[PDB]
Structure 1
């Protein structure tokens, strides 16, 4: 049942660089999915 996450924590992931200089979308996916994990 759901996950409690702070909007600041999801916002760190997409503020490390401008869109053009971000890690591959695969690495960003893993970060985000790990932040919303059930354990």
Structure 2
């Protein structure tokens, strides 16, 4: 059985603050970064 994923918001703020809105990686790559951050795999 699983629970709710706990993630400190500074990591997600680093994910999005790595670059400006223009000249950011494409949204598939940023989605895989956010999903691997919120993935509950040990």
TM-score (norm 1): 0.92
Displacement of 1:6 in angstroms is 0.3
Q: Is the helix fraction higher in 1 or 2?
A: 1
Displacement of 1:23 in angstroms is 0.2
List gaps (5 residues or longer) in structure 2.
none
| Over 2 Å off, 4+ runs | none
Displacement of 1:13 in angstroms is 0.7
Matched length: 39
Of structures 1 and 2, the larger Rg is shown by 2
1:11-35 deviations in Å (ceiling 9; x for gaps):
1111111100100000000000000
TM-score (norm 2): 0.86
